[PDB]
């Protein structure tokens, strides 16, 4: 299976932005245990959401996962420059995980 | 307090092998799964496999089966990955990452990654 995310998005401080995660083989369901991971400059990774909508402790309020239509999604409300990073999503297919290509988010 | 520790890098020759280590602290090593992930330039992540530290049972990405070998040392609470017959395709950063397999299903803590560089 192929997991696809937007390659890049650009937002402004205070704006709301949503990134999505799509599956090659059909709609994404909770059975896929959608995870969102954040990579910051020099190769610093923090998990952010797991089991499609569980915020990891420490993760600010402004981030949240949900299923929108047939895709997994991560929304950030009132984006800060701090949030500039690459967001990966990972999907689970019974005998393995598959990662998406990442969305580089620029905060003007 | 939760910490996954990996050495910074390996400069190795084509066709040799390396053992990568990841030492966990600040939590109960056998109560979470450990995954290994590959990051190649300008690409993202490729999942290698996972290991249940409590059973030593493994699941590998079919792509990596004749390449990698996952083991642990329960007493020293360390996860290892061995890579065989290293080639140019093997140069990348390799991360160990904790998965809350019985909790909220997240890859919450990540090692800093070991950069493997193959060169003659």
UniProtKB/Swiss-Prot annotation, chain A:
Q: Which GO terms describe its cellular component?
A: immunoglobulin complex
What biological process terms from GO does the record include? Answer: adaptive immune response; immune response
Q: Where is the Ig-like domain?
A: 1-105
User: Which keywords has UniProt assigned to this entry?
Assistant: Adaptive immunity, Immunity, Immunoglobulin, Pyrrolidone carboxylic acid, Signal
**So which domain of life are we looking at?**
Eukaryota
User: What other facts are recorded?
Assistant: Compositions and partial sequences of RPC 20 show no differences from MOPC 104E. The sequences of J558 and S104 seems identical with that shown.
Recorded protein name is Ig lambda-1 chain V regions MOPC 104E/RPC20/J558/S104
Species of origin reads: Mus musculus (Mouse)
Q: What is the lineage of its organism?
A: Eukaryota, Metazoa, Chordata, Craniata, Vertebrata
